[PDB]
Amino acid sequence: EKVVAVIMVGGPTKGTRFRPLSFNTPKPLIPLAGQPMIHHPISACKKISNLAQIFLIGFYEEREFALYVSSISNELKIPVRYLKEDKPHGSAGALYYFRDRIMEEKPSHVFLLNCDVCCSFPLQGILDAHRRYGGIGTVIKVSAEAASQFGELIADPDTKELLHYTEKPETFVSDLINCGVFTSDIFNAIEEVYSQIRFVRLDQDILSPLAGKKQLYTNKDFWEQIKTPGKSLKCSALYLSQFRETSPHILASGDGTNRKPTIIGDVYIHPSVKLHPTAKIGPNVSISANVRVGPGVRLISCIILDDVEIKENAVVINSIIGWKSSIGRWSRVQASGDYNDRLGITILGEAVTVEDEVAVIGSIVLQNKTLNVSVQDDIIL
Amino acid sequence: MKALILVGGFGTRLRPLTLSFPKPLVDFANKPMILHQIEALKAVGVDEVVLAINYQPEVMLNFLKDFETKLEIKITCSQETEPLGTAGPLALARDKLLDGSGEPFFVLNSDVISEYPLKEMLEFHKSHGGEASIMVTKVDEPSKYGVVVMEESTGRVEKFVEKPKLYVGNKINAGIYLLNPSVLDKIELRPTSIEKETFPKIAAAQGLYAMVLPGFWMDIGQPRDYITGLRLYLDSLRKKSPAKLTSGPHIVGNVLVDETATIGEGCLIGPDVAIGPGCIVESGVRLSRCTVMRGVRIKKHACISSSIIGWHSTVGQWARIENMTILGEDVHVSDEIYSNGGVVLPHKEIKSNILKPEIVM
C-alpha cells in the first residue's frame, strides 16, 4: 500500500488568539517544547514506513512556510509540501479542493489531523486498526462532567463504530469525544454532498450522517486542545514528559554544577544557549536557541523563545517570553498558572524590554514595548 | 530656507493606531499629521525638510516620496542609533541645515498642533535682530509644565522654573522654535535636553527672545486626545476659513467632510466629526465628536459618539459606539453590537458587546 498525510494549518484568522506572538510567527510555527507546533505531528509521520508525501494546507502565505518546510525534510527525509487554499472552505471543502494533488500517487489511506492538537499521535496503531476495521474512516475517555467542551458522541464498543454524533447540542453524552484516518473513498463522499447536495463542515454533514452505516470507526495517553496561547505550557509538559519517557538524552538532565546548571527534570535546552551554573532551571521549561541565560535565575513552568536576554537574578513563573525580549536584572515575570483564566499565563510580546526590578504579574505585553514600571492584572498595548 | 521636524519614535503611546503606520503617518482630520505643518512650511517657502526619527524610515519612504512632488518640498530622513535627549538629534542633522547663507531654521515637534503663524514670526525676528526664537502659549495649569519666566515688555526669557509651588508665571513652551545657524555649535556630543540644558545656556546669555502663540495648543500623547484636539482644530477652522467645513440640514457644528466620502440620506453628523476619503456612510447614522478614517464603511442605523474609527473597518447595522471606543485597522463590528470604550486590535471581528471598557485582541 501507500499512505499520504495532510495536516491542517489555518490562516491568520485562527491565530487571532496568539496575537502577541502571532504577529511575528504564525500559530503552527510557534515553538512548543522547543520545536514548532506542527513539528510533532510531522515527527510522527516518519514512523509509518509506507508513508510518502506530506501536505500542509491553509490560507496563510506560502512565503512564511517555504523557509520552514525546507528544514524538516533534511531531518526525517519526508516530502513535505505547503498548499495555499485560495478559497478556504473550513475543513471538508478544504481537502476536496486539489484532490488531484493528494491522490496523485494513489495512496490507500490518507491521514488528516489538525494543527492545534496535542496527543500522543499513535499513527501506526490507528492505521492498522483502520485496516482491520475497514470502512471509510476511524477518541479518549473523559469524565461526563467534562461535556461542555464538546458534546455527545456515541460509539458501540463491540465493533468500535460511531452510532451517533452531535457536534454541540449534546443531549446526553457517552464520555467519548473527538480528538481531531480515512480510505481513498473519502473524496467521493464529499462529491455526494458538494455536487449532489451542494462552506461544508466535516463534522456536521459528513460525520453525523455516517452513523448507522458501518464505515466510521473508533488514545490511551494524553490530549489537550490548544487554541489558547495559555495552553501552550500545559501541553508542553506532556511533550517533555513524552521526551522524558522516550529518549531523555535529548532533554537536559544536568542535576549538578559541572559548568552545567541545576536542572530539575523535564527541561529541553538548545545547544546554542548560554548558561551559568548558578541558575536553577526548574520543571517544565523549554529554552530555545541563541539565548543568554543569567546567573541565579529561576525558570519553572515557562517557555523562552530565541534571542532573549535574561539579566542578573531574574525570576520567570508561568510565562511565555517572546523573541528578542530583554528581562532586566532583579525583574520578575510570574503568573498564577490557571489555564482557564485569561491572565493565568503572562505572555510577553516580541522585543519587550522589562527593565531592572520591574515586575509583571499575570499580564499580556505586546511586541516592541518598554516597561519601566511594574504592572499587574492588565493588558498592556 | 531649511527646516527640521522632531518626530521621535514610532508612537508607542498611540496604539493600536501606530501598530502598523508610524506616528506621523496617522490621518488627523483627513490629512496625516505630518502634512499639517509641512504645508505650513510651504507658506514661508521652505524647500527642504528633515525628520529626526528614531526608527527605520524604510516603512514610510513611499509616503514621504509622494509628498515631495505634490507639495514641491525636499524631504529627507535622519535616523539616530539612540535619540540623544531633546537637542541631540539636532547635532546630527546640522549638515542638512547649513546651506551657507546662515539663515534661521525652524524646529517643530510632531506632538503639537496650532495655528502656525510662521510668516509673521520672521518679521518678529527681522525687527529686533535676535538670535533665537521660541513660541510660548498660556496654560491654566503652569505647575504641571515647565514655566518660562519672561518680561511682559520685550519678550526675553531668564530662567526655567519646573513645577512652581508658588506663582512665578503661567507661560510655557509650545514646542516650536526658530534658531539661527549660530546655535548648532553650542551643543555637546552627549545627549542634552534642550529644555533642561541648552535653553538655559542661551537664556543666561540674554541673546534670545520669545513670542506668544495666538492660537490653540494640544500635546497629543494618547489616542483619546484626537477627539478633543480635533475640536481645537475645527474651531480654528471656523475662524481661519469657514468655507472649508461642510454645512447642511444634517450638519451640526463643525464637520470636515472629504470630497471622496459619500453620505447617505437621513443622517445626522456633528459636532466635530472628520470623515476621511474613500469612506462609505450609510443611512440613519448619528455621528458626534468622533473621527472617521479612510475606507471604513459604517452601515445603516449606527450611533457613534466620541470614538475613533480605524482604516478600512466596518460598523454593522444598528451598532452603537460610544465612550472613547478605539478601533484598529480592519475591524468588523457585527450588527447590534454595543461598545463602551473598547480599545480593539486590528484585524478583529467583533461579534460580542463591549459593554464596559475593555482591551480586545
UniProtKB/Swiss-Prot annotation, chain B:
Its main location: cytoplasm. Belongs to the transferase hexapeptide repeat family. Pathway: Nucleotide-sugar biosynthesis; GDP-alpha-D-mannose biosynthesis; GDP-alpha-D-mannose from alpha-D-mannose 1-phosphate (GTP route): step 1/1. Diphosphate binds at residues 9, 11-13, 23. GO terms for cellular component: cytosol; nucleus. It is found in: Cytoplasm; Nucleus. Interacts in vitro with CSN5A and CSN5B, but in planta only with CSN5B, which targets CYT1 for degradation in the dark by the 26S proteasome. Forms homodimers in the unliganded structure. The product-bound structure is composed of six dimers that form a dodecameric assembly. Pfam families: GMPPB_C, NTP_transferase. This is Mannose-1-phosphate guanylyltransferase 1.
